[PDB]
Amino acid sequence: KFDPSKIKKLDDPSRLELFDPEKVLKEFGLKEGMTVLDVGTGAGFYLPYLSKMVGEKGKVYAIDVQEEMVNYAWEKVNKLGLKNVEVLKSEENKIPLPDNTVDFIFMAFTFHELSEPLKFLEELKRVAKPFAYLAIIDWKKEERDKGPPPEEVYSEWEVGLILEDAGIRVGRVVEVGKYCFGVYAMIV
Template sequence: MRWRAPQPIDQRIDELTADARHRVRAGEVEAAWERLGDAHVLSQPWARSHLRVHGSMLGVGWRTRDAGEIAGQLFRLLVAVPGSLTGRYPAGNSGRSDVSAFAPVPVREDLADVLANADAEPAAEVLEPSEVRSLYDRLAPVYDLLSSPYGWFGSKGLAEQAIEELRLQPGDTVVDLGTGTGRNLPKLAAAVGQAGTVVGVDLSPGMLERARRRVSAVGSNNVELIEADMAAFDLPSGTDAVVSSYAMEMLPDYDEVIARLAEQLPPGGRIAVNGLRDPERWPEWVVRVGSALSRPFGVSEAYRSLRPWEAIDAHAIDVVYEEAWAGAVYLAAGSAPGQRSGEDVE
């Protein structure tokens, strides 16, 4: 997700805006605008950086009591973020109100070189487990509220279908990996009944605390919550099924993890994974906006290459695959084969 410019460009933008402030104080207003124009050209591909440059421009307009510039910058503050996120910004434009906010201009060679080097920067990395933990600990109090719009658009239906795909029986033991605030837990608890057991696993104590409150509010007393990294989590013996909703795609080692889960389940034991996926049928600019909306949950462009449903296909049999939102959310479920694929029977 193009939110903040790579460090060297961000630093250059900071230097230019600091120099502009200094020049305004020294009465060199035109020189200040030149610095800000360069900072603007460098910032355009990144929403946050772009917004900050227009904020600095508004500041200069205000200091110089330039009403046209103040009005122009207020408008540009509104269009900067959508422009960067969708990639529809006028490249090379100085960002001042004396030029159209929509007219591209040839990018000066020195600035074009800086931008070309930025494209060579490595892509954003996926989060380390400690980063996931602290992000979700912070998110825990607002997670249900923030994520509720996903439910309105059908992701909830797919998560419920994932639970149905587990084909649970009373008395079963089921594990929910990346259980979060425990959305799946009441349904799982009801499906396995009092004689069964539900185990919710998550890295984040803050999310687990919310899950604990949820299960006690609905009176499910057959649920156990465990703080653990699902990448290294071994299924308790006797586990009949595993589900993971909107969590497996945060795991770079998903293939290894799903292979191990399929080995640890008894033959025919079900595994169901659902979550967000790179929507191949969406226009790129819509993907970027969607990616921006998922950013509070730690999902960046780096996650676009993670494809847990392929691991279900590779390590399970009797596979079911469904999509919603024109391919932006998926459900993949299958049964443990009970024998490693490729092993010969003597």
């Protein structure tokens, strides 16, 4: 799990150097009116983005298993005036949402942190509508002059395999700005 006392590392405007937030989202299919789930919301860094992209009509559920991250992200939305965002306290494999409520699922740098992936994936489909798109973004499994140790992350290869076990269908796997990759998946 990410360390709560290092949270400022998640609220660093220099993260933009990894990839353009709305360029990537728009390309992965996030649209106005869509209800999006932000799994490891952390500091709520990408929240201003997701918020903007769904607009007045959409909604953003920002979850996180850690209470400190939840309250930090919350103060963030209020500080910035993000009215369509709902920050919630999550449990490892349980999302506090009713079935078929999400259109877009965004998982930024949080997949490799899941205790029990395929079990979390099942919980994910539940809250996910029959349609639903899954956008998973993470670090490459090599060595980089900017990201965490490789044994600490999955490689695009492993991830998309797990998704397969879980039943999710992967359609695209593209590099994301020199340090990360991204995966396009649709929930069945």
